[model samples]
Target: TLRAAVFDLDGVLALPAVFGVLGRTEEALALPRGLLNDAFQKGGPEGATTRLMKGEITLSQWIPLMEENCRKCSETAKVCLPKNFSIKEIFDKAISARKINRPMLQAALMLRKKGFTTAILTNTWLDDRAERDGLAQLMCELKMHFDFLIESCQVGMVKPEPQIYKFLLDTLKASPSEVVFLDDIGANLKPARDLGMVTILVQDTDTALKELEKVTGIQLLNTPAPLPTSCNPSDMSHGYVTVKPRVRLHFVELGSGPAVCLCHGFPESWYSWRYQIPALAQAGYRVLAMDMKGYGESSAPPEIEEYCMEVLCKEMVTFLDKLGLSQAVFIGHDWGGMLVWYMALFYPERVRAVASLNTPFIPANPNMSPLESIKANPVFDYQLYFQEPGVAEAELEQNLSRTFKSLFRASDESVLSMHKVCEAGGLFVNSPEEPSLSRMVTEEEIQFYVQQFKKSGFRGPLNWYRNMERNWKWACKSLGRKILIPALMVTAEKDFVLVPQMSQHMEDWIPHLKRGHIEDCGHWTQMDKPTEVNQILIKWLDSDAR
Candidate 1:
């Protein structure tokens, strides 16, 4: 029933230490810590701060006035900013140093999406009235994260005043019980509570969001972001959600109907599903594409065990839970494909139906180590190189553009030659050279991959490889169990590493299995032949067989 969310600015929107520099100003002038406040409130209502905030005098004029008062209050140090400072300079530096509270910003955005009116209710004073417009401009530069920004300077009444509370309520047209107010200062919150509004005394960003969630009964922290309009498909939006204390997954959601969750593999993002999102939505399905943990916007916990397959599978369950879905048709590619297969194995009830591209469902064998098994076949020997910490990330992130170009340039011509390096135990060979990028995806798409990886780095992604043995150990419980759900395995004809032969016997392990292949395509099957992949997906989803 919470409908309106009113927030404070300082210590709420921005950090409290934003003005701590002022204390240094006092110390430089040989004055006490309380000297500034004392000088400002020298005569209560007719104080220097009051006069400056009410536009009676400029900050330039107030500086000397405060200096004189500080001189009077000085017991130890002599004041001097003659060459070191000016009031405008100090004030500008303070504004520049003000860091936005990101979690709180996200909370405000989440509240707006959940049918709540949002406002910034703060008692902030600008140096000039015209600076108010500059403040609005600043908000735009920092996401304009509120609906209405009400300053005490504008209303002439600060918090702890009943009229200010009434002004916020009347402006937003919300009842007291339906409104929630959050402020770092308890005095500010007290007035809101007195007015019968839910008051959250925010001590820190995490505690504030936690309290806000408890009061609203909304998944504020755990909510994935709405995709921006500027995404590949203009209609798509994206954001993050807090799944656990240490886990957050960024996801892209669009369209409408029963959910179809798409997961991307190693060294990739939800952008992998750029082609399929609009197509699936057009075919009347809700598309949920996630940048799985360790890649893109998703949380990449530093611990190697955090990237274990079992942990990732549980993360998927939580991901779906946050989306309010009991079950979903899960699809994945490469490492992502391996996960959806494992998802069907460990958390089968959560899968309505499962689909995988390129990767075959290789059931875990408790007797053998995954690294040893891959070592037996040099085709996947690159995995051995990734098993060590700092090795793969150092190499891959060194030249991101080259790395993605080489990886995404997945063709029989390119991969056969590339695998020879892995065949000879040379990891990521020819990875630094300017690659003849993939025809399956454009140069622009390649740049997109480069840009995302540059920000996220490659350490978390490599951690997934580090946890291979841990995954096999965790998968032992589901050994020999056939995939109970309807499953689709799409093979890429030219993907020599994960050959079509790999999926040849999926029927042995999947009772209700279906299979398809995209010819003339390499490891990047979906992007290589998107139209065919989409047609197959829509057809399979439409049929009773699924």
Candidate 2:
């Protein structure tokens, strides 16, 4: 635990840099009367600093302007004290007195006497020798209570970099195991607090203390932070194979019943069931649709073994075990359909009933896949494309915005052109730098995709495709397994990848298969027409319909 604190100098302990000189001009101005903000906007010699503070521009761009403003102000402001009264002289004079900022000093001393460690952070230009000398004198007057000081000029790093804070921590020999910072800027605070340091915004003495107490439960000046939340570790885990490990991991409970396990289509997660999390809950059966590992928010295993069908199946079983349920009615869509089919084949005793959407099966084609049938066309080409080392993640990252836009409400050009990938069983050759592919999702959806791909990356999701060989090997061993449960295969007639023909010979493959077809939809059948999808879900899952 750190007995120290890191403070932002400009806003926390010093005048917000912009008004440091004006307050030195007169005692009346020294009295706080919103003059700080006034000087921030229109004060001579310092308005440009406020502009930098506002982030309208950056410090790098504003420094030359500050130089010009300083030169001009030195020639004009007739503050009675300094000879020639230059703005530089004005600032130099304030630092020499170092007594005007009584409130800020008192607060810093109070924090120090209470045994809190404190450091000051500043973004000052050190090139001015007079300014540097003046600050040295100012620190000597403050009685040296500070653990250390950080000036961006010396460190070549600003507040948000985190290394600057670490510099302070290291100089004081403080522990990352326990540290906290008080700063004026939220931007700076975020990085510090995210690294596990408690942060409080120091607006003023009274408000600073209140915020400190609220965050740490230390109401008095010297009291320590309350027992850390880390001291009492969180004990919670919901079995979904993995939750959104990137954004956060937490259980979202919903649904109950015959444990109808829900799975979303290719390239989507349980969030695709946002409309259905509550719907399934209302329907009296458990529905579980999570980010397919490595796709959305779920934890992606590091190895390819994690993506194999056997591994995925095992995860499903583990989730069931965690939920304390033995079996479920497996409901699936697209790639989800492919998974449920395999799950039933491997563990038929665990499935009371099964429903497949978008993709249908040829029994235990265990060896059969979308890859083997199409040799002439190269358009239905996900399998071949995913067989690479790092292509998909790169493709997804480069075209994140476009991918999401085109995938949803896919265009005729896209549907037909992308269909050509299956003609040659690989991604199209001589493809343009940017392909004709449109986003299958929206921008909000793209944000989710990009954020996830950034964290988990496309390796795990793409790993699923690489496992085709492994799955085929498994199918060789488990070939004749038949699914005897009440089965469903819903086909999107317009689906370019997994076609309506998927249902044509299912009887020959999966003997108990019953088929349903939706004419208007494509690969994303359910999302394209959710009402129809829900109706089918309602009818098929209800025992009365059967």
Candidate 3:
């Protein structure tokens, strides 16, 4: 029986950052490939890199020895050292570029939840400089998920040494046969295996997880299931469901009955439905508030085509199947609203009903793409700027607090129009005035948004707009398809971007559509008028009789 699971930190729990930094540094400094590796390996068993990992020397002391070895190794490659070369700069780059392996981290948490002792045994250089440079914070974050974190520097013992493996067994109070150890290095696995432990060499994450499942008889990676009761808005319980291969979506699940899937818009997460989840769940509905693809905790595929309307809608239908739900009442706001409307057209059978707030269903034009149509208007200039990939990501990530503050506004009274913002250059270029958070959201709420975006970033959210042309092409298939389901369109009077007038002609396509309006609301209609929105939704859903 498996009593404990140990993970190697650098390549198993987190990506290997140092090698990537060294590779990039070599290219930038016009040095030959593998030059840094050869330099680090010059002293063999007692190499500077090994010594550094074993806590024998500080990073400052290791730098000079690495530079000396680099010069020696470069002489054989016939390359001279660049003027004012700094190995510390390369280390700094590595420190800043470090990223967590989220899937593996999730698996670790799952193992712990199943009553298995989880530990991270890493061969890492721990110094005051490294601590200050984010390694300390990284360990602190990782500590919350694992039972024990055994660092090579702190233990004065590194991997591939039998003593360290014995030390781990001693600390865990488990026999070697009861432990399962995973590492990316063959040498690390060899020692653990020799000690009578189940060892897995993790070359591929998915493959290793499968092997782990077989050994432990515990499902480490499985789709999320709906919870029994409504989750608190502040401390929400969420789960990750694999809607498609390589596309796991994160959602907050509450209640258990007829499903009402809530899809959030761009730059927003499931938290957008913070007020709606409890109200709807208490009223007898299973509320699934999801972070749409490329937003929040959902998978953000890199390709722009992956975010097209057809693909996104199909994924939602598949999501329903994953949850054993034949159909669901889909509700959306902003981009989510736009997506829900598309869901009705593309996969009507999977949709029991549809509701949208702020965004109205504009009939698709076969001849003209939405991008081409919007390009002619200055109101959508901000969207035009979002077409190019890196430009918007750079600007939005520069100051996330300011970006959310500027975008999540109640009224445009004190702000410049999107047209002016784009005309001057970008979203933040012309806006010199510091905008305040909307009345609907608290400072704590804004900070939550900031923290989420910090992890997922703007690239995925911006890609949604990048697919406007592609989405237009796909929309041609359902050019005149009427939404033949119980539908509701909730308009906000003060929402300038999606004004109330846009939803006026929605009845032309949605013959059974019901309309409700919230007065003095902004683009964030749901947040601005939660009470009114809830009243409208509950009243409509209750009276539908379908």
Candidate 4:
């Protein structure tokens, strides 16, 4: 029932420029973090900053006051102010570093498209022609996305002043109950909410969009629809969803029926399930193969803790909600296989069934963390090498073609052992003599992977390995938990990393588990033996036990 969407300019629609500049200036001046912010806040409701927002003073006038305030704060804190510090330089840097929040811009565009009036309510300061031009440039960039731009400097009023809220409603020709406003500051939102308008506090972009979606009944996340059934890559429809704020996931969805989510393993995208997508879709199932976070078109968050199992599992649940699906049958390969197992353990109701290839769910050992447990084993050296963030990212990104060629190979005995990876001090340190594309993938396919890695790099994927200890701690809670849902384990005959023998004890944990084996298969089970895998999957899904 919302007719208009109003957003705060600084933190909601664009990156908070002032705070970024303040933080950077503090670091450059060797001042303590938050010191500048505290100094700025010291200019209370009637201070220079508030006066500037009320258009009583220009930015040129405010810079001297900020410098004075910073100096005063430093003296009180018993810290000497560094000489040659210039607040003007900090303000100039902020102008140069201004960035538009793409997601928020897109959301505003979407709301406008859906017949909602979109406006930006910003508290700002303008000093000279240069400052005016900078503001103009940003407005010019966002001119098409919004219908109105209400500046506090232009209007001589700022947020939480009640008058500006009334002015915005009057400008938009909207009733208070028919408008939704989003702002980072609680005070800004409180006034709007009291005015009988729906208000959302923008802590992060994703959470704000979600709240807006709920209030407006408009889908802000770019969720995709399933494509017509097709085995050809070109025919497959690609889509993206912001599964979490700043965490967008790219996926290829095909066909229509009961949901079957395909999660690809490390260093791979949705293309890994090229064969199974059509096969499963053709057999009457909705198949969605996603490029897990940090790969393909998805957002690769830099932090190692972001790639933890608990976070990944929660993202998947959110993804399902976005798709309007209550439950899904999850199919994973390698690391993805391990992910599906955890999904089954964590959210049993959401997972109708789970099937893994090359990877088996080994119960968590409460006595030892996964990294410590595997430390003594030489075979896990590659994982240990990946623990250090930049080291593995640099090595793998050095030569994309070489990285893929080395990893994507058939079941050959001459393949380099993983333990030698760290001992040699790099992933491709002891390169294979003939690093050729396996029979499973064509040159075009290999090129596709190379092109993807060229953009996404290996930082996000390697981050997954860095969270082994965190994943262990999460899995520890499910030590004796059995996978009660229908499950499938497809083992490959020649996969050295995840040996077929490793899945021997899986039956003890999964009561309704169905096991399938492929002869002469390597680590890339589905790709290496598509026909066999398809038959096994379809047959099991259609079976009475399922």
Candidate 5:
């Protein structure tokens, strides 16, 4: 029985990519037809394609080399020796022209349903820049049909090389005989065939499917597979998933059932879900908790605008799509709660239910900036201190461990006293206090947060606070909207700015809302009173009531 199926992208599942680029080059260069091929042969001599595939040379470096070679090889076309060419612009045109071979694409999906592991092994180079939007769009299109994608640029090994084939074989842990490979190139198929695996050459989609039927003993049709109702977790209990093809978020997941994605607020992590993960898991939920962007191992783009509500919300939506989930209940605390509120308002179809603690859904008012709204209350004054760059960073990053301890303590009147001081003076009022363990989190748990903070510093977390006005402007687009999904708002009575009564008007915005209050708890409701919060979640999730 076959355990795995591998495919080549360019010609097998899609039309040849070079044909589009060749036409584009002819249009720009005004050279004799087929003469560019001569330039590639002379310039990128032996192992040139291999070197490009292995990322040894970027497209930028390869282009000028080809141009110079064209100059040396052809005496007649030497006049246009050095046209300043753009590889990205030309390749983007090629990407636009790409057409899928739906029949072959359906075959791979069929193999997946039959329990055969499916992957795409392509030998190509792409942009490595983090901000290159065109490259990200290209990769997303290519990822439309595969469980695993292995690009030669990513692995540093080109096709037809035994190393790349062996790398994929090791990943599947299958013997060569148990795997079947397909490619349009005779040269690309040779190594797999040499390794005692079955190989098929595709001259056309119909011929390829016929050969596939012989190998698998099943006739294929052009029907799409049922969308997977569930998603597989990372191989490791903790790993990263790329979202929006831009942000790579790190998450820790456990158990198996419908997804309940937990998002942690600032100064906390997936570890913040320590109390709830096992509780939800045992309750028959596949609990997914992530370290939000700019926290832990997740990608942190330095630009201030990147931390806005619009971008963060898009990343979460893309994260759900990548997990193969059509809908999931989102539970968030603090800034994480802030994101879930946006998801419910803007992308309601993706959210099955939303449960937020402390953060309330306050609809944007285009008449005033968010800063102006917060400035009206002394309780929210600290955000003004955080909005100024280098203010909080100077104080917090200096004593990373001490900051978390001071912030996460159990609630009382004293927590309110600090914000009163914030209203009169700055957040750092005086010199920083020494570290003291909070009753809310253990020494070990606090140390982990401190260690991560020491590595990442406080800049990214503070950047989120900087986007208040920017968030307001984006929120204005969805103004006067309400979260129509089933919603739960858990309030902490003793919290300063996010007081329990602050969430009272939430029923106006959240139809079919459920409210829970935890008395004697601080801003960190789940941490300060785990049993109460867990019970509230369980009751709300199990309730038949909308």
Candidate 6:
């Protein structure tokens, strides 16, 4: 089931890979000439997977490893294996053997520069070690690129199955538009795109970069960047679903109950919804925040048209179909808000209700996007900087875990350096690159984010910002549409990123609106005022939202 079809090709094909890879892998794994081949190839394919753990070693080497059973086996009696296999042994046997995909990833790095989240789904032999130490160590040596990792041994189910994809959806808390899948196999990509993930086929390293360029419009990623306080990294996956995909899509989920999706503005994703999730869920409504096309976990196709509106809306609609939600309440903040507005106008039925915060939908000139014109002000510096080819996403990899930790860990009276950057309309200056976030996060939490973000820079989170204009034009054409559902809005009275004035024009653009404001809050409304946010969300949830 794992392969296209394991057709019992040959005895050699049936031989266990654990033993075979030892022949040509790293120095730690290098065995004596023909040792593994002879050991596992005994009696054809039978008992091969076990021989590497036992038979391949010589008397001196084998005896030290099997001290307890050495005498027994030497006595010509049957031997019982002891608990001796270490994670290093498993990592050397499994992960280190295969050459990782780099060119494809180099291209993927560009999409990440454009803020597209990407991940790798492989059939891994995990749990063969203790406490994941071995895999963790291996991840360090490899410097793998992924927002999340999905393994067969870990997930139980293999690829080309619907359940595995479903597991990814629920785990990442993502709909399909937030992800674009790439695989070496066509069959794998086929099912994923059907599930609403943009799919790409990768062959060789050259072809990998080419196809990547074709889809995401990125050339390559910047390597050898500096960071503040990054020891290690990787985004990841898990959740409530069994039948899922073998391929990995590292999605960020926010909110709960028949979920109402939210997409971030420029350079954000479900993490943008971090402070918002628990608030809405407590109010008894499913709030879904997605990373729209070309941003955050979604595929970034090559052409400027790849970042176009036509493709994105279709992707969103397809994702809804895969999720089995015929219609849902949709909310977008910043660029995300704009996307939701477009969704309401062009595909109003798909959005049962729509609410946009911080940015107003100006129907007069739909061509204007949240991505554009933000630079007219100083605080909007980051938005303008993102338009520079591969700047924002590239800067992210410098020290992602710390960057995100710092970005999210804003407390009362913190530096608010981004605030300064915005006000000056200059770049966020991290010159020497040291970990000096005035806001504090626990060492344990910081470690976790470091590992995950190291797996892949916040490409998935940033992709939502890249498509503002296209989404804007989409909304402008459909301006006459009104949101019929009981809508709720929380206008942060002192938002640094998205100003409160943007909320004032919503009444003209959207008719069905119930809005509230937070006095002490800045950009982080839900996180800063959880209780108030909950009250606002619950009030509307119970109000017969139509």
Candidate 5 yields a Cα-based lDDT of 0.76
Local error of candidate 4 at residue 189 (angstroms) = 76
Candidate 2 residue-wise lDDT, 1-546, digit = tens: 457666666656665444545543534444334332343344432356644543455544655565555444434553222334344444555455543255555555555657877777665544334356556545544435465776666666556666777776777677754566777677778877777777887666677867665554444444432210110012212444332233222233454466777777656656555545545554566666556656655676657766787877777776666667778887888767878888888887777788888777754454355357434345446567667667665665565545444455542435435644434443433244444434334455446555555666667767777776677777666666667778888888677767787478778666767777787777766556565666677777785222
Q: Between prediction 1 and prediction 2, which has the larger TM-score?
A: 1
lDDT of 3 at 134: 74
Off by over 4 Å in 3: 1-234, 432-434
- Every model's TM-score: 0.56, 0.50, 0.57, 0.57, 0.55, 0.48
Top-lDDT candidate index? 4
Superposed model 5: Cα runs more than 4 Å off: 1-236, 244-246, 413-416, 420-432, 544-546
Candidate 1 residue runs with Cα over 4 Å from true position: 1-235, 410-413, 416-428, 544-546
lDDT of 3 by residue, 331-389 (tens): 99988999999998988888888999989999877777687788776677888888887
**C-alpha lDDT of residue 21 in model 1:** 59
Per-residue lDDT tens digits for candidate 5, residues 56-83, read 8876666666656566655665545335
Model 5 steric clash pairs = none
lDDT of 4 by residue, 149-197 (tens): 8989889998888899999999999999999999888888988999899
The models' CA-based lDDT, in order, is 0.76, 0.60, 0.82, 0.83, 0.76, 0.51
> What are the root-mean-square deviations of the candidates from the true structure over C-alphas?
22.2, 22.6, 23.0, 22.7, 18.5, 21.3
- How far is 372's C-alpha from truth in model 5 (Å)? 1.1
Least well predicted 10-residue stretch by lDDT in candidate 1: 225-234
